[PDB]
Amino acid sequence: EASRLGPVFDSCRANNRAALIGYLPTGYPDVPASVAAMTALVESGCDIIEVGVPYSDPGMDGPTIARATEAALRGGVRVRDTLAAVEAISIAGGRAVVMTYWNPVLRYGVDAFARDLAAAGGLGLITPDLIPDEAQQWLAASEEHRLDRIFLVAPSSTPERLAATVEASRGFVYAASSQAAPELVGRVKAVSDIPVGVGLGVRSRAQAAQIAQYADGVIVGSALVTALTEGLPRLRALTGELAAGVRLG
Amino acid sequence: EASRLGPVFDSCRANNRAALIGYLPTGYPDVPASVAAMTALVESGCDIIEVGVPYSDPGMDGPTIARATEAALRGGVRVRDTLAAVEAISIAGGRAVVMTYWNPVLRYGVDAFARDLAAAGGLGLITPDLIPDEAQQWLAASEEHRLDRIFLVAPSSTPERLAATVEASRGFVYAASSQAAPELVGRVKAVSDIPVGVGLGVRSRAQAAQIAQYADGVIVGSALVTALTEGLPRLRALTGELAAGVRLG
Amino acid sequence: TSHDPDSGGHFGGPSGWGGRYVPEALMAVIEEVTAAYQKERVSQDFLDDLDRLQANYAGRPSPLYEATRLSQHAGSARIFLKREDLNHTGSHKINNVLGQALLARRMGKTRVIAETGAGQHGVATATACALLGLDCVIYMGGIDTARQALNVARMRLLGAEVVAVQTGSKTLKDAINEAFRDWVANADNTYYCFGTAAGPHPFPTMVRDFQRIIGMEARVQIQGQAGRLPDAVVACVGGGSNAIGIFHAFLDDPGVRLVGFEAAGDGVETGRHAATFTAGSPGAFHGSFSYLLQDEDGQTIESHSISAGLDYPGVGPEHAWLKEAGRVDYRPITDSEAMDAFGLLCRMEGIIPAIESAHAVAGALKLGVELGRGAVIVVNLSGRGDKDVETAAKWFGLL
Amino acid sequence: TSHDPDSGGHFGGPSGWGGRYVPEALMAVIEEVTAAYQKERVSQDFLDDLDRLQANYAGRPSPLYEATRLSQHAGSARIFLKREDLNHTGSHKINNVLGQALLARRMGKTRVIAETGAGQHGVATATACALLGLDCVIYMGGIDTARQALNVARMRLLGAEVVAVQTGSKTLKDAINEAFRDWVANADNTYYCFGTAAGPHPFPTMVRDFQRIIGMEARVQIQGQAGRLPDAVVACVGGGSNAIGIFHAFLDDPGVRLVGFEAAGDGVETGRHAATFTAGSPGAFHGSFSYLLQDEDGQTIESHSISAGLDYPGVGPEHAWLKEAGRVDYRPITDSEAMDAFGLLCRMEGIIPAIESAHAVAGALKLGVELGRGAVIVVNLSGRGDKDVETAAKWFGLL
Ligand SMILES: C=C(NCc1c(COP(=O)(O)O)cnc(C)c1O)C(=O)O
Ligand SMILES: C=C(NCc1c(COP(=O)(O)O)cnc(C)c1O)C(=O)O
Ligand SMILES: [Cs+]
Ligand SMILES: [Cs+]
Ligand SMILES: [Cs+]
Numbered sequence A, B: 001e002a003s004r005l006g007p008v009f010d011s012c013r014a015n016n017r018a019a020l021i022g023y024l025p026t027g028y029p030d031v032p033a034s035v036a037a038m039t040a041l042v043e044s045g046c047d048i049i050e051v052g053v054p055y056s057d058p059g060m061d062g063p064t065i066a067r068a069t070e071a072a073l074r075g076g077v078r079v080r081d082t083l084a085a086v087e088a089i090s091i092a093g094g095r096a097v098v099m100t101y102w103n104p105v106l107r108y109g110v111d112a113f114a115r116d117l118a119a120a121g122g123l124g125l126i127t128p129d130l131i132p133d134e135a136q137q138w139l140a141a142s143e144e145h146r147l148d149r150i151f152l153v154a155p156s157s158t159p160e161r162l163a164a165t166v167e168a169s170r171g172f173v174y175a176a177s178s179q180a181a182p183e184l185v186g187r188v189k190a191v192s193d194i195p196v197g198v199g200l201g202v203r204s205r206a207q208a209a210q211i212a213q214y215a216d217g218v219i220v221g222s223a224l225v226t227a228l229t230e231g232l233p234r235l236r237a238l239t240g241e242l243a244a245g246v247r248l249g
Numbered sequence C, D: 001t002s003h004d005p006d007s008g009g010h011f012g013g014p015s016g017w018g019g020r021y022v023p024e025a026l027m028a029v030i031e032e033v034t035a036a037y038q039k040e041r042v043s044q045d046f047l048d049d050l051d052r053l054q055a056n057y058a059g060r061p062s063p064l065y066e067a068t069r070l071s072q073h074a075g076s077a078r079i080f081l082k083r084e085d086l087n088h089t090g091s092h093k094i095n096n097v098l099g100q101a102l103l104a105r106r107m108g109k110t111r112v113i114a115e116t117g118a119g120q121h122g123v124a125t126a127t128a129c130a131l132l133g134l135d136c137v138i139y140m141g142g143i144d145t146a147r148q149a150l151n152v153a154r155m156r157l158l159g160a161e162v163v164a165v166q167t168g169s170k171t172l173k174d175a176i177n178e179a180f181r182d183w184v185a186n187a188d189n190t191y192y193c194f195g196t197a198a199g200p201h202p203f204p205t206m207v208r209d210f211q212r213i214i215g216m217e218a219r220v221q222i223q224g225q226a227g228r229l230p231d232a233v234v235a236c237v238g239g240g241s242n243a244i245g246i247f248h249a250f251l252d253d254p255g256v257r258l259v260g261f262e263a264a265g266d267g268v269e270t271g272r273h274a275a276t277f278t279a280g281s282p283g284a285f286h287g288s289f290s291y292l293l294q295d296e297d298g299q300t301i302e303s304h305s306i307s308a309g310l311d312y313p314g315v316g317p318e319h320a321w322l323k324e325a326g327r328v329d330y331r332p333i334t335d336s337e338a339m340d341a342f343g344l345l346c347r348m349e350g351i352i353p354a355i356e357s358a359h360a361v362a363g364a365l366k367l368g369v370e371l372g373r374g375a376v377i378v379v380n381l382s383g384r385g386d387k388d389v390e391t392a393a394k395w396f397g398l399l
């Protein structure tokens, strides 16, 4: 059957644009202000929101996101606060997926977390330190609770692993990272029709537009955190510029 | 036939008393002052003067002598200054022997030092770090230049080594130290009629007289150096008191 | 092969302990190290190269010394010390490092990176890279640079760049996080010389295979000196390299008790400890599914110990498996227990152990009381205490 | 042996090297130690105890390691390092200490004293006294307490008392003077564990006999690895114990060049050196007739070296004899040369040497350039550099 995120990408493709995919960590700079920021993203034209779960040992986040997740953990952020963020985003007419390191999901219970996320209106899970090789429980929870499953590929991924990682993904494949980003997207396009989101330290309209030529979704995270730290108005302005960037004409 | 210090100990033995043997190191507090102090000892009643050769690594010397010899060396004292002091002592009517560690004698040359000591009017050599076992060159030089050879015995000396040391000595034997000084003099008397000198950190009239009751000579060093540090008139007074002590026993 | 995991690195079944809980961005280089190790572990020429450096450069075998003057504090049991303290660089770490540095050269890698807590793994890596002409970068928590400064200075004399890590607890776990970051950014040219029996496959198995020599030698030596297999073999447990190294040769000796001793810090009831098995629970951490100290949400609880080497809130997956199976017991030893033992060994036998290693000595003393007169206990004396002398001197009022 | 002195301690008959240049007050105890050594050196129980401790406690044999990365810096010669740095306590000193400390106990002595410069002899002495349960007191020059402080802390952790010596140069010569003063006063209960191949008979011969093991192992090991005897065997020379230990087994091999390297400090023409053979002359010092730095009246001239272990104006009498006979050549190595070699060994082979041993490595590099490609040169690596890491890092600007 159709993936949960299928209609958003179908719709974006029909209007000659990429989907704008926006990341914010739950609890930064505190729980209420982060919910207000995530709502703002919905109101300012984010097609998909990645609700980040702060983690004590976030090996793959750059310093902007890492400082923000640290502040969130100092403020007492909980995993259930990410489920609340998903609820508020759904209520505001948005579409939320969660991005998390795997151990918090194991600690919660994989089946339980998929169930509760689905209940809150969550559409999927982005798993930056879960590879399909270790995802058996997650694949079963994902099919049971109709949640998409977004694995990452990298420019270094072998032919064999890229194909297995694409085949295991539903919703979109995250092409994490220069011609590396278009070359990696083109390798996913050679084996499958799944939408490909591209993260590339995007911080301007110009860069989102560049990526929207070849990718189905433009992923922005660091620049949204930086904008939010300055203030909610700055976040709105930036998200606006990025929303204009993803549309091609 | 007879030793050089033999007629000194005879004259004491006929005046019903012990010999006062006085040590000063050459070059303390400087060379002229040390000679003026050694001459003053002759005038103040010392029957024998031990002229110390300052040495850079004096294993056996206590703190008072060690520090005076260190100061003598910082002031530039040379070995030839000792031979100059011996000559001044002999011209004043005194009877001088030299107390030295052995390396200064090796460096000078054993024969040449014996020759030059005798030419200065020296009567003997006290050798606190030369045992008879190493004394071949010195025994030969001692016989030829007609110098007494004063070796040391100790409370710890085995009977075999005590006999060997006494036998090797001409002039007197230095018994260096409970009831341990009289016991050591006793063990020397059991095998030889050679005079025995006793050094025991003597400071006083009473202590000198105690020692004169069993020993042929009373050796004073530390206390003479301590007196000179205060002044030359204190040396005279002290040496006068000790001269009276050796006539008591 | 018998105790090995499956090709995905799992102990105890296809979804049990170990595995590869890593990002896809690290899988190319992880597969490359796995293939390289699978090839070289059965090459006699590789094992010759390793054996030759072990003998002539590192001075193996390490001796087994019967520490007879400890006996009265150990219930009159007989403590035998396996003297990895006498290895080149001063710990067991050099065994693993020699294997991996040889492997990195076989792979054509020009740059080596490593994490370090006590600085013993950092010094060993720096040492091997100097010997083999490889560039070396070592990551170390800033709290550890301050309390193991002798080892920082050594690494630098050996030509290594030492990078002080200021994130999180500024201890071993945070150095590891930084090392993994370096590796994903520099995979083309860089080998990651992983320092303990933890991490994603192949590291738990490879580290252990290079530390097996300790238990192989000890099993022969204790039969020679005591006339029988021991009643127990014991070790301290950080991530688990020295313990698995000495344990492995005895796993199929069913009469031989195996006991691992973990750092309990101020005590397990204080929240200032690293007693992963005593107070932790299963989870995914630093590339493996194993035990870790974690809160209700799955956030890592920061470890504390007086020992920089045991100050790690996780543990290797093979130990998790051996725990679950009932083959090894894991027990807490506090800072104070460790320091009493440190001092006892200095005074009684004239051996200054590493503070890590003194946790094992403390545990053996207790085990000795439990087992009683004549019991034979082999203790891995994982390292010497030169790095800890200032800390120990302060503890004992000696400046 | 053919190389032994007469019963008085004299080498080479009438040149008269060695002997006993001490006060009569020391002779009862010197004779006592001499006789106990003659009795115990042929006692199987003593030899067995010494052997057991060398193997199981100290970790003998030390390996011999072909440092192939040094070759291009040594005229393409082949430098083999005899790794005394891997011994328990980290130098050769432990060889002599195990022998003498066992002997102290056989004599019924209840207190052991020693001098130390680098603190290696101190730490070793303290180590053996912990092992055997003897009171230990170590005399150490005040300047050495400051520049070898790691070792002062080790000594005190081992239960030894350390007395800082503030007289004269406050270096090794002055520590020796104080320890001789102690022995004089405490002779009936105290054994003096003399740390180098110098002093009155029996110390030069006895210390050499306990260090002979180095050269016996080295002679076997080089034949096994290289297929022949070396072209040269070299070592650094303080008082002479590590050098005499490695040289002795080669004395009767006429094709084996023997070279001792002595500390030249700022340079031999500067008056801040410890180049005893290069600039000294015969004289009596510290119980022996040997060479020493002395002025024209025979006052001891104070030595200087960046190395605390070679900072001694004297040298043992058996070396004086070997020099006179033309069997061994002695050559000066400056502070700078030694430090360049220190850093080289660090970067090329991953071995942080003692600054003492670095002088020997420096000389080996020069001798390699003389002897040329293929020449085999055994170097005694007498100790490791833990104690010198502060100094060396300061020298190379690594702070
Ligand atoms: C973590 C580090 N050392 C751990 C260590 C340990 C504990 O680590 P294992 O990997 O459990 O063996 C034990 N003994 C010594 C002497 C050690 O140095 C390190 O030096 O990087
Ligand atoms: C003087 C001291 N050591 C000298 C020393 C020497 C020189 O001493 P020899 O007796 O010349 O070997 C060489 N190498 C090392 C590692 C040393 O520590 C001492 O430890 O007391
Ligand atoms: Cs060995
Ligand atoms: Cs742990
Ligand atoms: Cs304390």
Ligand SMILES: [Cs+]
Pocket: D129, D130, D133, D134, D135, D136, D158, D159, D160
């Ligand atoms: Cs002791």
Ligand SMILES: [Cs+]
Pocket: D237, D238, D239, D262, D263, D274, D275, D276, D310, D312, D313, D314, D315
């Ligand atoms: Cs010297």
